[PDB]
Amino acid sequence: DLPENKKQALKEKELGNDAYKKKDFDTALKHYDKAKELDPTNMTYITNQAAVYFEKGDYNKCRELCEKAIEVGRENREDYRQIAKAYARIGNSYFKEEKYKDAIHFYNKSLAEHRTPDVLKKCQQAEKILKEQERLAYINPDLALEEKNKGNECFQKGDYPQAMKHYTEAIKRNPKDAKLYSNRAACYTKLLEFQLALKDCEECIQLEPTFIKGYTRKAAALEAMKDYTKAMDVYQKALDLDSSCKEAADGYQRCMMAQYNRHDSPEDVKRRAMADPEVQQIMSDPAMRLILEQMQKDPQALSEHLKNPVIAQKIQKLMDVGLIAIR
Amino acid sequence: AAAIGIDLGTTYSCVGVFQHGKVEIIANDQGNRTTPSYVAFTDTERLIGDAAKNQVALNPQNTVFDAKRLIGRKFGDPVVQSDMKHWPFQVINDGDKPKVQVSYKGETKAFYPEEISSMVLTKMKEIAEAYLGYPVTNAVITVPAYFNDSQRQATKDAGVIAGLNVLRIINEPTAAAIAYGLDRTGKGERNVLIFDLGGGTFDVSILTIDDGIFEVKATAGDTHLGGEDFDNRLVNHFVEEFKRKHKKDISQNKRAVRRLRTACERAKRTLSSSTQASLEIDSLFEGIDFYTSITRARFEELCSDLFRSTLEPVEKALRDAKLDKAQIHDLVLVGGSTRIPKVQKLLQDFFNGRDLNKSINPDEAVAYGAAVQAAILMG
Numbered sequence A: 001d002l003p004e005n006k007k008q009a010l011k012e013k014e015l016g017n018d019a020y021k022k023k024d025f026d027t028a029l030k031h032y033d034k035a036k037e038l039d040p041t042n043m044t045y046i047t048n049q050a051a052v053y054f055e056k057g058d059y060n061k062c063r064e065l066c067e068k069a070i071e072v073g074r075e076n077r078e079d080y081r082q083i084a085k086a087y088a089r090i091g092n093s094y095f096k097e098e099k100y101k102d103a104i105h106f107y108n109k110s111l112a113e114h115r116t117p118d119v120l121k122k123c124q125q126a127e128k129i130l131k132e133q134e135r136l137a138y139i140n141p142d143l144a145l146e147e148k149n150k151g152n153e154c155f156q157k158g159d160y161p162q163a164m165k166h167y168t169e170a171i172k173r174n175p176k177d178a179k180l181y182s183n184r185a186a187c188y189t190k191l192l193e194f195q196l197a198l199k200d201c202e203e204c205i206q207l208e209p210t211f212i213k214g215y216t217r218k219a220a221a222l223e224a225m226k227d228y229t230k231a232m233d234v235y236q237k238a239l240d241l242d243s244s245c246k247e248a249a250d251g252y253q254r255c256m257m258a259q260y261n262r263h264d265s266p267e268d269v270k271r272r273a274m275a276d277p278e279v280q281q282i283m284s285d286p287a288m289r290l291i292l293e294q295m296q297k298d299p300q301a302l303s304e305h306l307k308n309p310v311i312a313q314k315i316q317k318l319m320d321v322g323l324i325a326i327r
Numbered sequence B: 001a002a003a004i005g006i007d008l009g010t011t012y013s014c015v016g017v018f019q020h021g022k023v024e025i026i027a028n029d030q031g032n033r034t035t036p037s038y039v040a041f042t043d044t045e046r047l048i049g050d051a052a053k054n055q056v057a058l059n060p061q062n063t064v065f066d067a068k069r070l071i072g073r074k075f076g077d078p079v080v081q082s083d084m085k086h087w088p089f090q091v092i093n094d095g096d097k098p099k100v101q102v103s104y105k106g107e108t109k110a111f112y113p114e115e116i117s118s119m120v121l122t123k124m125k126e127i128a129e130a131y132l133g134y135p136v137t138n139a140v141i142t143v144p145a146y147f148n149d150s151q152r153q154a155t156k157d158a159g160v161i162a163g164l165n166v167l168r169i170i171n172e173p174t175a176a177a178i179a180y181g182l183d184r185t186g187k188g189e190r191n192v193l194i195f196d197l198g199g200g201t202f203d204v205s206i207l208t209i210d211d212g213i214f215e216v217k218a219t220a221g222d223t224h225l226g227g228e229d230f231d232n233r234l235v236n237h238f239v240e241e242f243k244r245k246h247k248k249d250i251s252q253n254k255r256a257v258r259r260l261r262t263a264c265e266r267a268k269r270t271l272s273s274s275t276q277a278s279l280e281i282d283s284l285f286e287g288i289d290f291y292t293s294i295t296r297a298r299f300e301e302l303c304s305d306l307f308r309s310t311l312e313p314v315e316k317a318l319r320d321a322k323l324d325k326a327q328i329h330d331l332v333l334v335g336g337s338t339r340i341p342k343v344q345k346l347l348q349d350f351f352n353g354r355d356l357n358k359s360i361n362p363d364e365a366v367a368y369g370a371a372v373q374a375a376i377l378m379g
């Protein structure tokens, strides 16, 4: 089946494999070195020796061996997957030394040889780690302050899009600046990007729960979008921090009436309420559909079912959005 | 009138015709199937092709090339702003659109890049008409795969100016795939890597072909790598030798350089066949005749990195296409520079001995493919 020297290299390969199962790195190297000389046109002996050097932490030697194996496999037309494995291991030495940029370079070569699932996942980990390292390196609170300040100069002139651009650079430079998130939120509210005002206000608020302005900016966007029920709740959270606050009190009072005055046509109610996944779930759930039918037909079904919070709050949500009216 | 296809490059172009069951490649008046994408505005005539290329020696400020680098672009476009710095001709802002200024018959004139291209296309039209014995308007013009919409329309308009019925615009790698019969697999196969090492650019792309339908999955390339920089390394070799023999650096003498460079191109072509080429220029510098040589091995050493760098875009395209090497069913060579044995060797090593598809001359395959598609559109 094999040339005698190939078979001899194989017997040594197998003995080397057993030596590695037992973590006998050095006996195994002896077996693979014999196997390598017996059958030199075969990457497997070289990559196995590299496996030792990788496990030992001797990454420079294992890299030289992987590179030699790659050159040999190409000369001798060995499977592309074998070449890929040697590259994957090279990327692994860099991964282990935390040189993720190099791990990626070599994993990219590995993928070209074969897009091995293991490489795809390991290189993704290398990217995630390197990307976080890069953001942390990017962060610099003083540059964030300079961009923030230019954003403020623009903002204050009514140039909200430019302010937003500078605020974006400032946040890349300082991610915990709660005030900065709310300044962007303001740009969006003024530009009618009310949805974006909400997302930046929410991060501002979680970072600084007492920043009453984060709440008034969010609530204003909600009120503007006729989401008076949440706008009132957000303005109220602002009132919980400071009951004398003007937007928190005034926006709250406008929402208090407007949330009912806007119902108008049921089409407005359906389009707005069904935008909310919570009521979509209530309506998509057949148990609720059955409960609702009983409720329409019998006010006592309501009297009894609403004593249990699992139903009472599904109903309360449908009432809050205006889908269920009670007379 | 028989349909034609035109291969429109930055330094060269070629026209094919489909007649009597096959594509013929039509040589121009100098016997060249591939003729320069040069226009020379002399003080007596507007020359196109080799007539124009040969005038770069005499009126370089009035000759043009690389029209495609300006076509479809805004004047303020960073590409325009960078590339003009390396040209003998002036790029002009006319409505935030580059226009090229030359002196023609002593007059100051400027033409849009599209006009320059139409002049080139007109010449290709004349070549085809003279060959066939009749006017031909039915044509297919190819473009680089990375072209945007303004660029494709601008190319089509250049055809309109030339007087062609532009039937279609085709990406250069699709045309090559057509030329090699890869649209006749009858399968969901093949994944084909097309490697275009051209005059001033290197374009690599992966096309996946499924029973005649083509998709570009990935592109990669180098906008400042092509055959011209191999010629540039060759110029530096010869300049250094001239300098050692005469203690004279001739790289600052534009006439000496243009003539040396032209000879270098010829030596490079010689070396794609032989292992030796001669450099033979009378009065190269200050009346000094310069006679020397280069071997294939020396050329490869001068350009060893240029050749190796062509594989980096290959790796990039494979990753972007999410393919490995094993998944490439075919390898296609496009561009005259792929005739260099070193390129072929690098691709074979990169791809572990897989054959390269050379059944059609690499610098004809695009014109060829365009002619085939043109034939289809017209029959």
Ligand SMILES: Nc1ncnc2c1ncn2[C@@H]1O[C@H](COP(=O)(O)OP(=O)(O)O)[C@@H](O)[C@H]1O
Pocket: B007, B008, B009, B010, B011, B012, B013, B034, B196, B197, B198, B199, B200, B201, B226, B227, B228, B265, B268, B269, B270, B272, B334, B335, B336, B337, B338, B339, B340, B362, B363
């Ligand atoms: N026989 C040959 N051997 C080696 N190089 C060649 C040969 N013929 C042409 N070339 C080179 O090929 C290039 C021509 O590019 P071309 O094939 O027109 O592609 P593109 O139009 O995409 O730029 C030039 O760099 C030229 O010097």
